């Protein structure tokens, strides 16, 4: 299981798809769904108010150090995320670290 089935790369930047579970003790990657192709990250919000995608875009934000928008399921557990401006393989490197 590679972060590679979780990503690509289109003219703006890099679509990591992922899919949350909130209310975790730490927002982390904790895992891979290797049939869903999208990393496994727990989300330390509330998924209220819109905290849950909050906090999943400060996490990535922080990261990456891009801009994180949510491109697909805003009011879902399986989320598209576009990292602006960066390539895949700077995103892996930034995953895998
Ligand atoms: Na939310």
């Given at each position: 299981l590679?972060?590679?089935?979780s990503?690509?790369?289109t ?10 579970a909130?209310?975790?003790?730490e ?7 290797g049939?869903?192709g ?33 491109v ?26």
């Open positions: 590679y972060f590679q089935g990503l690509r790369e003219s703006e930047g890099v679509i990591l798809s992922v899919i949350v909130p209310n975790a003790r927002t982390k990657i904790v895992g891979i769904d049939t869903r999208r990393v496994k990250v727990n989300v330390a919000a509330p998924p209220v108010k819109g905290k849950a995608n909050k906090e999943l875009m400060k996490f990535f934000k922080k990261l990456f150090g891009a801009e994180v928008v949510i697909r399921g805003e009011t879902s557990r399986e989320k598209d995320l576009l990292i602006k401006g960066i390539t895949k393989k700077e995103v892996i490197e930034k995953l895998e670290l």
